[PDB]
PDB file of C-alpha atoms and ligand atoms in Angstrom:
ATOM      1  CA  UNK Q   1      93.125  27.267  61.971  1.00 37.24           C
ATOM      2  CA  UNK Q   2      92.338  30.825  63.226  1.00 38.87           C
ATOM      3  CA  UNK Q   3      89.638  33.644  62.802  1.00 42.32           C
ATOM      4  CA  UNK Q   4      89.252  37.642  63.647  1.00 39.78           C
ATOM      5  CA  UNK Q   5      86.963  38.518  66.364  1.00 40.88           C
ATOM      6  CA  UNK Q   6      85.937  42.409  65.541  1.00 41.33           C
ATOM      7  CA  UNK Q   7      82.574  43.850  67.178  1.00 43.96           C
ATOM      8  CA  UNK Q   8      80.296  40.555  67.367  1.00 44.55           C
ATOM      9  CA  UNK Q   9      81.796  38.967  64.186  1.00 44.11           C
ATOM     10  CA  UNK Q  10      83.908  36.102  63.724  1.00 43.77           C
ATOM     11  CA  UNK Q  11      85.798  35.804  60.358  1.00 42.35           C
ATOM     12  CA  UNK Q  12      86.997  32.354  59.468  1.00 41.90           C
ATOM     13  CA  UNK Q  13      87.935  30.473  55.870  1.00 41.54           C
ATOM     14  CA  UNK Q  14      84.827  29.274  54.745  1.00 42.36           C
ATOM     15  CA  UNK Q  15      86.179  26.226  54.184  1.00 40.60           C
ATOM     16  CA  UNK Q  16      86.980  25.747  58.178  1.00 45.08           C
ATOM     17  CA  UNK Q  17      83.987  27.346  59.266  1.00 41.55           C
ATOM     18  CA  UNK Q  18      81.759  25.070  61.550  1.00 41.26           C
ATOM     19  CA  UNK Q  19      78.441  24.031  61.788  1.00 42.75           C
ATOM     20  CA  UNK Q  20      77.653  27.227  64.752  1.00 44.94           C
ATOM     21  CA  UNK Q  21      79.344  29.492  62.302  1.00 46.94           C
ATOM     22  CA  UNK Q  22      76.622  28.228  59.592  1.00 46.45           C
ATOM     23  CA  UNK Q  23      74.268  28.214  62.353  1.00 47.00           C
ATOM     24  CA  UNK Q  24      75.031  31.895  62.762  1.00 43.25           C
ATOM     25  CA  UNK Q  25      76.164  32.688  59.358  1.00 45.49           C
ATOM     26  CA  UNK Q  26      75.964  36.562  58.603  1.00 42.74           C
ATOM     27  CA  UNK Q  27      78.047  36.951  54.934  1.00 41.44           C
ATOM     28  CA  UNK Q  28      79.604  34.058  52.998  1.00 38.37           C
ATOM     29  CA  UNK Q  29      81.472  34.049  50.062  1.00 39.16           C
ATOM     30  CA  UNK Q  30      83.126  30.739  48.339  1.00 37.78           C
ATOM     31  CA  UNK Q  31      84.833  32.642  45.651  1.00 39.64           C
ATOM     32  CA  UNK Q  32      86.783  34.618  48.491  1.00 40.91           C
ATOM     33  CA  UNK Q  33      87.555  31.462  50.612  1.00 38.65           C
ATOM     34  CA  UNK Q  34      85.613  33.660  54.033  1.00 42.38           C
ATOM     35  CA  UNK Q  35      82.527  33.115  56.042  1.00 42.65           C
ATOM     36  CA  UNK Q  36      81.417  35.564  58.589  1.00 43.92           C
ATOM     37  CA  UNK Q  37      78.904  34.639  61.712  1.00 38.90           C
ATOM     38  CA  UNK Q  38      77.608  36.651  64.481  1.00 39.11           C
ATOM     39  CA  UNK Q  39      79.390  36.312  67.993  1.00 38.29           C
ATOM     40  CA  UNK Q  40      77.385  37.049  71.590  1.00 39.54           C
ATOM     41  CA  UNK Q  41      81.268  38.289  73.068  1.00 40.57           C
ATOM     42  CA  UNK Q  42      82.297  41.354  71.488  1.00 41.93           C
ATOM     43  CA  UNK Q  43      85.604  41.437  69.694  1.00 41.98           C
ATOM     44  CA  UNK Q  44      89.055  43.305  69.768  1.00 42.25           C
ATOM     45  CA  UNK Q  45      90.443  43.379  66.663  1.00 41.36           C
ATOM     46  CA  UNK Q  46      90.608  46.328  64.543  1.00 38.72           C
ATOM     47  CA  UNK Q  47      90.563  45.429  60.597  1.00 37.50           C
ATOM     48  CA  UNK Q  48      92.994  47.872  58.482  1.00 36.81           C
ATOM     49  CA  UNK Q  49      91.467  50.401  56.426  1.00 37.48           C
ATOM     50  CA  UNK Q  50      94.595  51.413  54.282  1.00 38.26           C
ATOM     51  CA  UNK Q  51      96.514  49.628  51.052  1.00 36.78           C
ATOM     52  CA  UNK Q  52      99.805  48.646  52.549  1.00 35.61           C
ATOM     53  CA  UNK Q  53     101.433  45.679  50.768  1.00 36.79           C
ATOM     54  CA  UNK Q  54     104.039  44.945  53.573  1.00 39.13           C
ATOM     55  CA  UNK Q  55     103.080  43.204  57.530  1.00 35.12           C
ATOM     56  CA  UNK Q  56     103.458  40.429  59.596  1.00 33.14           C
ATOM     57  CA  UNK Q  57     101.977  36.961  59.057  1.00 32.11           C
ATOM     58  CA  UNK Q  58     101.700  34.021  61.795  1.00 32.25           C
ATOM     59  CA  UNK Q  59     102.808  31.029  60.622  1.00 32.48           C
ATOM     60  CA  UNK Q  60     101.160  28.173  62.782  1.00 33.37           C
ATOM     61  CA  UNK Q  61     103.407  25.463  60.847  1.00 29.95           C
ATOM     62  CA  UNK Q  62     106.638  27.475  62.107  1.00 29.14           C
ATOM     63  CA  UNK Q  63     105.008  28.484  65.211  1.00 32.55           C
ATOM     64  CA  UNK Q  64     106.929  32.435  64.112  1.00 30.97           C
ATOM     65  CA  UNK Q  65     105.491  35.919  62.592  1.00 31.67           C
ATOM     66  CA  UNK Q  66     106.779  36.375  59.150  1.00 32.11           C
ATOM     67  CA  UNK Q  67     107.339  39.778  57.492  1.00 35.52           C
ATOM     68  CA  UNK Q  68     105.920  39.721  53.938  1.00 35.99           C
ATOM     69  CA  UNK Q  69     105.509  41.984  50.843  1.00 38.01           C
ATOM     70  CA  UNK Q  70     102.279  40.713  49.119  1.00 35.94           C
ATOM     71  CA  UNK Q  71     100.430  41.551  46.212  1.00 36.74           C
ATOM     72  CA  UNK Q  72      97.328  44.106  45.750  1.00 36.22           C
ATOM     73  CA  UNK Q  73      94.327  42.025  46.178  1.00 37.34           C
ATOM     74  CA  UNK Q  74      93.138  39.858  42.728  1.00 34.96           C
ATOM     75  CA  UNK Q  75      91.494  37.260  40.766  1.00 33.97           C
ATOM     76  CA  UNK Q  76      94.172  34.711  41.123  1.00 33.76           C
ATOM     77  CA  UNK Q  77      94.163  30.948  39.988  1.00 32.02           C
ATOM     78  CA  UNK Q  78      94.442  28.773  43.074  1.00 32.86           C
ATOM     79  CA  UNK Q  79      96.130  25.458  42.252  1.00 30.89           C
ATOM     80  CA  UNK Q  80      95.082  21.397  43.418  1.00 30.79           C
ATOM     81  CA  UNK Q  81      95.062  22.239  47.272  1.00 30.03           C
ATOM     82  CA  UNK Q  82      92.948  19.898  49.711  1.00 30.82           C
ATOM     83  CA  UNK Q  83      90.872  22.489  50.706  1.00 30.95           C
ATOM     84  CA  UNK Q  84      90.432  23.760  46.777  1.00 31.51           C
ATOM     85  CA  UNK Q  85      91.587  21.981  43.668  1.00 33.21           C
ATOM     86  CA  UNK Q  86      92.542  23.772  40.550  1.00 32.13           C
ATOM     87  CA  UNK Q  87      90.092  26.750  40.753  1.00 32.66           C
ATOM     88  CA  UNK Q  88      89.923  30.975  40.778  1.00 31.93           C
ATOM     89  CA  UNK Q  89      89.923  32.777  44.288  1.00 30.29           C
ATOM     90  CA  UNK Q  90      89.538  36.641  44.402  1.00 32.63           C
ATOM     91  CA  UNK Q  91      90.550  39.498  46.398  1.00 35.05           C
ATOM     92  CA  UNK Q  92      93.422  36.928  47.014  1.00 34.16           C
ATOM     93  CA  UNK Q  93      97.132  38.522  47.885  1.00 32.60           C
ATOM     94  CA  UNK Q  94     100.148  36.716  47.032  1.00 30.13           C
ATOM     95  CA  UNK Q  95     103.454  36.622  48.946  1.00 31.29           C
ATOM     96  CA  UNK Q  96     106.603  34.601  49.379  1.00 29.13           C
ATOM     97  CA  UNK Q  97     106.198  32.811  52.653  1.00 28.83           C
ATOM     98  CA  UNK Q  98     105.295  29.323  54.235  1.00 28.82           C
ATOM     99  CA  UNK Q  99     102.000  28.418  54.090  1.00 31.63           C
ATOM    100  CA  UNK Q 100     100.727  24.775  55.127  1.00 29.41           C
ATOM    101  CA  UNK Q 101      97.143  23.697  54.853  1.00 30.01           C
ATOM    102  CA  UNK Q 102      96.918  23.792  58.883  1.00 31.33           C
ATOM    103  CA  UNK Q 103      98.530  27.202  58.904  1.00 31.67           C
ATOM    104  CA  UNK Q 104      94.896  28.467  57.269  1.00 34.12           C
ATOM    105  CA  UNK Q 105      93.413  31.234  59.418  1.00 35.26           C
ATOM    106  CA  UNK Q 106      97.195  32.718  60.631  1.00 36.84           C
ATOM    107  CA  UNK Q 107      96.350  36.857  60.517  1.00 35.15           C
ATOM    108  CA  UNK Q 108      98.418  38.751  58.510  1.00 33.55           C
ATOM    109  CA  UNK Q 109      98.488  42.475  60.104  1.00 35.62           C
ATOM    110  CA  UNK Q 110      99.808  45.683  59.352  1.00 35.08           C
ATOM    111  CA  UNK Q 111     100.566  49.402  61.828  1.00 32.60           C
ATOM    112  CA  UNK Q 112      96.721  49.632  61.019  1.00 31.45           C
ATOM    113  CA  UNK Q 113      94.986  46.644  61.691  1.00 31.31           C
ATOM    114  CA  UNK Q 114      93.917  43.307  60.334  1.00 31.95           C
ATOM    115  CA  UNK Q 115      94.699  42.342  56.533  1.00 34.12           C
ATOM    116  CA  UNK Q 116      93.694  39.511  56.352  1.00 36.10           C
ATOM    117  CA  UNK Q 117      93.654  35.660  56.928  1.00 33.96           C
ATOM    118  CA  UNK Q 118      96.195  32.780  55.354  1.00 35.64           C
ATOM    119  CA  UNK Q 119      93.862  30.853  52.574  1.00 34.33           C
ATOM    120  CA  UNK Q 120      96.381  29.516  50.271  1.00 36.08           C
ATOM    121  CA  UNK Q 121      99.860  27.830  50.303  1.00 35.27           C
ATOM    122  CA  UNK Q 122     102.527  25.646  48.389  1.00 34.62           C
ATOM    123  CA  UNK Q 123     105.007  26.236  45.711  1.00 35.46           C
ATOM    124  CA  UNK Q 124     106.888  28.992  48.288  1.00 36.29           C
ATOM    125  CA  UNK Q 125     103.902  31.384  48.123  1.00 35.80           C
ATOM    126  CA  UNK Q 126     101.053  32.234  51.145  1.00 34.82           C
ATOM    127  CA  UNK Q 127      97.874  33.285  49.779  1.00 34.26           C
ATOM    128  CA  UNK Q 128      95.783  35.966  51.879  1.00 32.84           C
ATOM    129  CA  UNK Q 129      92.161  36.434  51.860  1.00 34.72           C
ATOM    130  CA  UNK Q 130      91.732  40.205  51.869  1.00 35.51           C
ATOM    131  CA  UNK Q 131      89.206  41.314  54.526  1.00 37.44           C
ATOM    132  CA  UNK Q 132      89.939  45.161  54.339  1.00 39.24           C
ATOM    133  CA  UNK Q 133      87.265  46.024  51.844  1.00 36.37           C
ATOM    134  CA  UNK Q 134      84.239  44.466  54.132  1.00 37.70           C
ATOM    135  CA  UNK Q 135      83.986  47.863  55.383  1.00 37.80           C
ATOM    136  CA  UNK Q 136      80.800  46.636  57.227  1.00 39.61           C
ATOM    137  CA  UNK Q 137      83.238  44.727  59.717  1.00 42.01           C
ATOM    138  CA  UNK Q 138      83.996  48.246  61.720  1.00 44.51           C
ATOM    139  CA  UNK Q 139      79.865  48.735  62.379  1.00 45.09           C
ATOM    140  CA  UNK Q 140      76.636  46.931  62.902  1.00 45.32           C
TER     141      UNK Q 140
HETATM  142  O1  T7L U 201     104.726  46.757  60.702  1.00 44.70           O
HETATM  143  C1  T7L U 201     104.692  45.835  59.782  1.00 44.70           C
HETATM  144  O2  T7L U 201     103.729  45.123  59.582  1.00 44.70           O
HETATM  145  C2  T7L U 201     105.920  45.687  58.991  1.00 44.70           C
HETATM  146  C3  T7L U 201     107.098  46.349  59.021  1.00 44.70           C
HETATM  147  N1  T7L U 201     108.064  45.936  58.140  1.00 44.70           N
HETATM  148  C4  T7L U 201     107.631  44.938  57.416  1.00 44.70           C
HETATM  149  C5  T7L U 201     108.431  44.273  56.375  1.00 44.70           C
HETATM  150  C6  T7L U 201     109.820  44.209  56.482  1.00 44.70           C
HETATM  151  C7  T7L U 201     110.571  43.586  55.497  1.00 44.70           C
HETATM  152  C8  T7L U 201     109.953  43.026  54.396  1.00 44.70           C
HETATM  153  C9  T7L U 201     108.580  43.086  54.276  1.00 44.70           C
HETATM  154  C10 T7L U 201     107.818  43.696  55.261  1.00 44.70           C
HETATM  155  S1  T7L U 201     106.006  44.458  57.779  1.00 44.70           S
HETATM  156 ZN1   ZN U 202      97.992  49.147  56.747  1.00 47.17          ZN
END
């Protein structure tokens, strides 16, 4: 589990998300693995606005922060996970890491913010769900 609080959003796999984040959904999409709802508390994370492809990852399942090179973000084939069977996932990032399905939600950060959120696992590879792009975020 685990979500980014910036301004009055919460950011959350979609496929974790609860009934109040449907209740106060803003922005979903299933491809990605996100859903974003509106929050009455402000938030104080800052999302990263840069393309670094090295930062720190928390690792619920290891209760430890992880450093990590990881891939641009992509179109990548997400294999038979609980959460997802056999099926495509974009602006997904690839590293070499331990990822469980209860480690889901564990931020990966950089110097300049928020990356992202663990989405995938097994096989000795974390999947990321790239938030950086959603611009929107940081406004509104
Ligand atoms: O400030 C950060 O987020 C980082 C600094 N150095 C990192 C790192 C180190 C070794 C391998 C991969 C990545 S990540
Ligand atoms: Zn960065």
């Amino acid at each position: 589990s685990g979500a980014i609080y910036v301004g009055n959003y919460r950011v959350v796999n979609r496929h974790l998300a609860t009934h109040n984040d449907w209740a106060n959904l803003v922005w979903e999409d299933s491809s990605r693995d996100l859903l974003v709802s509106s929050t009455t508390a402000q938030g104080c994370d800052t999302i990263a606005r840069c393309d670094c492809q090295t930062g720190v990852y928390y690792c619920s399942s290891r209760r430890k922060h992880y450093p990590v090179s990881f891939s641009k973000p992509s179109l990548i084939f997400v294999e038979a996970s609980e959460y997802y069977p056999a099926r495509y996932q974009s602006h997904l990032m690839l590293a070499v890491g331990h990822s469980e399905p209860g480690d889901c939600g564990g931020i990966l950060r950089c110097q300049h913010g928020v990356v992202g959120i663990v989405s995938t696992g097994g096989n000795g590879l974390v999947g990321f769900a790239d938030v950086r792009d959603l611009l929107w975020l940081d406004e509104e």
